[PDB]
Design a protein around this nucleic acid. Structure first.
Ligand SMILES: [Mg+2]
Ligand SMILES: [Mg+2]
Ligand SMILES: [Mg+2]
Ligand SMILES: [Mg+2]
Ligand SMILES: [Mg+2]
Ligand SMILES: [Mg+2]
Length: 1186
RNA sequence: GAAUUUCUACUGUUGUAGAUUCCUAAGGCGUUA
DNA sequence: GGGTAACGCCTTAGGATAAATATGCTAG
DNA sequence: CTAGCATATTTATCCT
């Protein structure tokens, strides 16, 4: 039943941001436009970006000025150096504790260097933008009045930089966070420095020197006590340019020195550069047409002042190549030779084989440019693999050149993209063809001897005119290829530095924002900053008139900060009058547990004082606080949690509609409507999930016991129109349906349907942060509870396995505790309550669509978005199956245990799918369940730990278990047979030794198949399982090769029994009587027979028989299971996988079953390990009795 | 040639079904012309 | 495969606040 | 000289 997840609700809190659209009401938009609140806020974005860049430059200079004067102790540096070189050993107390201690000491030294500088006192305050930044700009000579004006525009608006200052505070921190300077300089740069030191101390001390030592100080860069110099960005740059790789560097020297096999193999010791210091570093179609016409005129011209037409001049010059001497004409060694071989002979390797077999035999002295005469000589004798005895090549190179020059097509001479693209295609095809004869740069590995003047002198001047296409083609491909709509939105402030930062009643003349509600529609009023007291004094609240519902939001944000601040402030300390004992308790930190002076009595006394002060405070005693007895508090954390949980209430006050209308009309209030398509009068179906969250924020049931909290610091954005031309489906005209399974062929609408209507007009935005499970205990890691429940009670817990199939996008298999399969279904088609969608067909069609439209340069993209919008349906299906069938979910481990390629859902997409399922199961609601029923809106399931990173999650994420997908597809489902063989092919001796360890090779008189009896103990350094009996009945499909004709990736159904019979009979081997075949197979000789026998042996052991063209893909067993029956996926009994992709999901489910058995058996929970091993998995599948 | 806070599949009829945590900052890696 | 940055991913970090306090303006 | 008001800016710092 539902007992499994009934106790896994309300575990830890979550925070999410809901997005809406703001529709201005009445004269809101008119007044917004009149006061120019949109241009101002779009200019503020540019000003904010420029001032942030200026502050970044200021921080750059401060970092360069601070780290320059720091001097590390050095002895601690030597301690870190020796600890880093103490070998692997073990993670004992020393290797970890002293490592962390020295790292923290160095980091704190760097941070102390930061703090000592005078500029650090007011680096994150109003002083920075008021005085320090203008003074710093004035000091700089280059400066600029524009920069000073931009900074001065924020002289009374500094609070707008609070988030940026918080972002920039992370760099000057002690904690080991990636966004820090000390952390970088002690954890990332220094290990690279020591690695460079050790690779130098190895390679240089070896002394096989052939490079320049650069000695004829110098070596001080690599010695110790120099890490102080490379602390700044200038030092890092100096170290990198010394390393190098326009000044010669050590890395360049060593890379050039790795040749002649003296040190070439030792490429790993290559010097890695240090990491960079933190925070340190066409127009239109008319112009394109003009450039195209200019190049056309430059190409053809009008045949004036001699023939300047490059198209025919180059053709004539190439036709004249035969008359020119071939002893001085050079040819490129690049893929142009491959093209020449493919065109002249039809084989792309003839010329290269001639050059590597007849021209010379060492490393061939590889040169960039060969000579035409040498190629002619080589082609005159190329061993004539398969051709006429005498080949009429003549001047084969020149013959091919002139052939492609004129007789190839006789069509070289010639606004729409098609014509321009075809012309460009022909042009750079010709330029690629003529490129081999061009001399690249000068002094390219020698050669470049005295050239043919009469040919090459004209050729070099002719080719430069045609070489202008490459930059032209680059510009064309850069300009022509650039999405229909745009998602750039301007943030709106409404003249308030702190807007929407909080909803509290007291803090509403400062944030100038309220919520209103009427007839189930939620509005948002952002009052003008000039009149911010309009809501302070409501004239009346009579109920006869139609009334809005203004929200009375009250909150106590943080108890640990708010309580001492209010109760221990010079303004209020007299009112509350803390006793001397309480003041001493707070000062000495006795209440805190982190301090060594922890005292339960002091903490309880402070808690009692806080309770009394809260009772005294007028705005806080209205919260209706109800605390536990003070004697039950373990520490101050419990009291703070209680205050935070109970310090939040929402009430709705009634205000006249006429007052709001007058405020909107007069321009004092900007009234929007928080809108969603579920808020429309025509909406009738199930509302969106975020709409349910928003409406539950203010529900009476929710407000009785808060589950949803309205968080402050919201944002209002403005998105401009992005799509000018519209594709509109006119009204009263039938529209063809896009769903083939839909019975209704056409639909008629009495109104227009504009494509992407949300992007053709200006739309406001509203991002509302909300919190789920406000009063949650905080069990962020439910693994201990899930494991305890699974061990205690699991007679009815099923297992679900998800594997990305080769053909099927994703395959699902649900199994019991006994391994019996209940449900098998490929997730390629999702059958929801409506007609099913063939997502496999969609992706299959759209991949072809994208690859064919890429040449057309239509920026369709998609594919990714469809595959990332497909996985949402799969996540919904998985959640439904988990809730309905009481099953855990087991998946592939993509960190350690990932699979190969050639699956539809690649590793990158599968990681995102796993992340999406983890996120969904963090808070899992059903739009159909009751609000209070478990799994409903107010009692949501929480079946997964909060997601932080792919690496942080281990082998268990709550109810999701991760297993290595090693040996999950190519295993028999019935028995546990696995093909662990790695035969390969070698000489006769090793093959004969291999076949010598088979127990018994024989022919079965009955049923007409071979028996290959053996034991796994003879093969590989493993001792597991028992002796198997591999047969020759269940292996059909075989492929010849990977490419080319007469051998290809083409399936050929062949009976291995018949082929084995023919192979044995054709060398007079007798097997009719049924005798053991070990004799007469040791006859040796005829190695090809051994290759054939070994290929059949590999053939008779493959599990997955696949055909590329046809969809059939079946797994068929080579061994029987206690009844002389060989498994076959084709003739399955619905208790075994029906498909070659089903086997992976079934075996992942079985791995999860093994995980469940391990959890149940162990009595040492909260410490047990779940990472399965290959030996244990092999023993599990080969468990004899099931 | 298809409406959406936003995405995907739709017509499920001014919308249907299921995802949907947003803003800012820093760093690392990969394709290539 | 020799010392190129426009895109495309990944990692990490801060926040999702009311109230005390300092400062500018009116008034004197 | 100048008490009071209104606004902008900073601050208060649990424990797992
Ligand atoms: Mg303000
Ligand atoms: Mg709906
Ligand atoms: Mg798999
Ligand atoms: Mg498979
Ligand atoms: Mg929708
Ligand atoms: Mg769409």
């Amino acid at each position: 039943g539902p007992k499994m997840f009934s106790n896994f609700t309300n575990q830890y809190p979550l925070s999410k941001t809901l997005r809406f659209e703001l529709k201005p009401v009445g004269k809101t938009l008119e007044h917004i436009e009149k006061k120019g609140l949109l241009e101002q806020d779009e200019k503020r974005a540019e000003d904010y970006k420029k001032v942030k860049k200026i502050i970044d430059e200021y921080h750059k200079d401060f970092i360069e000025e601070a780290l320059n004067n720091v001097k590390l102790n050095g002895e601690g540096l030597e301690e870190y150096y020796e600890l880093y070189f103490k070998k692997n050993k073990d993670d004992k107390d020393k290797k970890k504790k002293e490592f962390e201690k020295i790292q923290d000491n160095l980091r704190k030294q760097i941070v102390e260097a930061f703090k000592n500088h005078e500029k650090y006192k007011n680096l994150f305050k109003k002083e920075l933008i008021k005085e320090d930044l203008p003074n710093w700009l004035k000091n700089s000579e280059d400066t600029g009045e524009e920069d000073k004006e931009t900074v001065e525009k924020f002289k009374n608006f500094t609070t707008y930089f609070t988030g940026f200052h918080e972002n920039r505070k992370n760099m000057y921190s002690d904690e080991e966070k990636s966004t820090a300077i000390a952390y970088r300089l002690i954890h990332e740069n220094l290990p690279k420095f020591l690695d460079n030191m050790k690779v130098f101390e190895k390679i240089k001390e070896k002394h096989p020197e052939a490079e320049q030592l650069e000695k004829t100080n110098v070596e001080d860069i690599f010695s110790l006590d120099y890490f102080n110099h490379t602390l700044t960005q200038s030092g890092i740059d100096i170290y990198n340019t010394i390393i190098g790789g326009k000044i010669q560097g050590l890395n360049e020297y060593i890379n050039l020195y790795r040749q002649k096999n003296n040190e070439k193999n030792r490429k790993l010791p290559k010097l890695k550069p240090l990491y960079k210091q933190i925070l340190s570093d066409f127009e239109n179609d008319e112009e394109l047409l003009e450039a195209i016409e200019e190049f056309y005129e430059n190409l053809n011209f009008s045949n004036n002042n001699e023939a300047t037409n490059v198209l025919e001049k180059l053709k004539e010059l190439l036709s004249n190549l035969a008359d020119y001497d071939l002893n001085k004409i050079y040819i490129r060694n690049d893929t142009s030779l491959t093209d020449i071989s493919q065109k002249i002979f039809g084989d792309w390797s003839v010329i290269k084989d001639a050059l590597n077999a007849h021209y010379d035999q060492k490393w061939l002295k590889k040169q960039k440019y060969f000579s035409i005469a040498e190629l002619q000589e080589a082609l005159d004798s190329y061993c004539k693999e398969s051709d006429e005895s005498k080949e009429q090549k003549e001047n084969s190179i020149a013959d091919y050149f002139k052939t492609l020059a004129q007789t190839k097509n006789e069509t070289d001479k010639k606004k729409d993209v098609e014509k321009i693209k075809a012309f460009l295609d022909s042009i750079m095809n010709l330029q690629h063809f003529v490129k081999p004869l061009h001399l690249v740069k000068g002094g390219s590995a020698g050669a470049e001897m005295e050239k043919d003047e009469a040919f090459y002198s004209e050729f070099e001047a002719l080719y430069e005119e045609l070489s202008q296409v490459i930059p032209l083609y680059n510009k064309v491909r850069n300009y022509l290829t650039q999405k229909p709509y745009s998602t750039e939105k301007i943030k709106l402030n409404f003249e308030n530095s702190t807007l929407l930062d909080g909803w509290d009643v007291n803090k509403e003349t400062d944030n100038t924002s309220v919520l209103l509600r009427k007839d189930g529609l939620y509005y948002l009023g952002i009052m003008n900053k000039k009149h911010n007291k309009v809501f302070e004094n409501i004239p009346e609240s009579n109920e006869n008139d139609k009334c809005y519902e203004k929200m009375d939001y009250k909150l106590l944000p943080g108890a640990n900060k708010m309580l001492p601040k209010v109760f221990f402030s010079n303004k209020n300390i007299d009112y509350f009058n803390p006793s001397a004992e309480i003041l001493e308790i707070y000062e000495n930190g006795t209440h805190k547990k982190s301090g060594d002076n922890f005292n339960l009595d002091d903490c309880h006394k402070l808690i009692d004082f806080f309770k009394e002060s809260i009772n005294k405070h007028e705005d806080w005693k209205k919260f209706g606080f109800k605390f536990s007895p003070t004697s039950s508090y373990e520490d101050i954390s419990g009291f703070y949690r209680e205050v935070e949980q109970q310090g939040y209430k929402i009430s709705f006050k009634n205000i006249s509609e006429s007052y709001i209308d007058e405020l909107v009309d007069e321009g004092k209030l900007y009234l929007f409507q928080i809108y969603n398509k579920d808020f429309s009068p025509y909406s009738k179906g199930k509302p969106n999930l975020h709409t349910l969250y928003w409406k539950a924020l203010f529900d009476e049931e929710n407000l009785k016991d808060v589950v949803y909290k309205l968080n402050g610091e919201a944002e209002v954005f403005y998105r401009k129109a992005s799509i000018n031309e519209t594709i509109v489906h006119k009204a009263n005209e039938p529209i063809k349906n896009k769903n083939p399974l839909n019975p209704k062929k056409q639909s008629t609408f009495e109104y227009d349907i504009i494509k992407d209507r949300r992007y053709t007009v200006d739309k406001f935005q509203f991002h509302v942060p909300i919190t789920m499970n406000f009063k949650a205990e905080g069990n962020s890691n439910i693994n201990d509870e899930v494991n305890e429940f699974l061990k205690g009670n699991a007679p009815d817990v099923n297992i679900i396995g998800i594997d990305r199939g080769e053909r099927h996008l994703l395959y699902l298999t649900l199994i019991d505790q006994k391994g019996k399969i209940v449900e098998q279904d490929s997730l390629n088609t999702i059958t929801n309550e409506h007609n099913e969608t063939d997502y496999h067909a969609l992706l299959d069609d759209k991949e072809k669509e994208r690859d064919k439209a890429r040449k057309s340069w239509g920026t369709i993209e998609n594919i990714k978005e469809l595959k990332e919008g497909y996985l949402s349906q799969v996540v919904h299906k998985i959640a439904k199956l988990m809730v309905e069938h009481n099953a855990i979910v087991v998946m592939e481990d993509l960190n350690f245990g990932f699979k190969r390629g050639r699956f539809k859902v690649e590793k990158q997409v599968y990681q995102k799918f796993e992340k999406m399922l983890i996120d969904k199961l963090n808070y899992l609601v059903d739009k159909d369940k009751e609000p209070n029923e478990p799994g409903g809106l107010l009692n949501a399931y929480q079946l997964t730990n909060k997601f932080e990173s792919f690496q942080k999650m281990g082998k268990q994420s709550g109810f999701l278990f991760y297993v290595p997908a090693w040996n999950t597809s190519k295993i028999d489902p019935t028995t546990g047979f696995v093909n662990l063989f790695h035969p390969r092919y070698e000489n006769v001796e090793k093959a004969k030794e291999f076949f010598n360890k088979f127990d018994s090779i024989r022919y079965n008189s009955e049923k007409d198949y071979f028996e290959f009896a053996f034991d796994y103990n003879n093969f590989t350094e493993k001792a597991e399982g028992t002796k198997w009996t591999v047969c020759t009945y269940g292996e059909r499909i075989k492929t010849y090769r990977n490419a080319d004709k007469n051998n290809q990736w083409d399936s050929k159904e062949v009976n291995v029994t018949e082929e084995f019979k023919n192979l044995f009979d054709e060398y007079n081997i007798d097997y009719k009587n049924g005798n053991d075949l070990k004799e007469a197979i040791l006859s040796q000789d005829d190695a090809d027979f051994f290759k054939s026998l070994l290929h059949l042996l590999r053939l008779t052991l493959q599990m997955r028989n696949s055909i590329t063209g046809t969809e059939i893909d079946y797994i068929i067993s080579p061994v029987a299971n206690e009844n002389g029956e060989f498994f076959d996926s084709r003739k399955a009994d619905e208790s075994l996988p029906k498909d070659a992709d089903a086997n992976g999901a079934y075996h992942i489910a079985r791995k999860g079953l093994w995980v469940l058995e391990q959890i149940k058996q162990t009595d040492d929970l909260k410490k047990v390990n779940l990472a399965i091993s290959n030996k244990e998995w092999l023993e599990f599948v080969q468990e004899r009795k099931n």
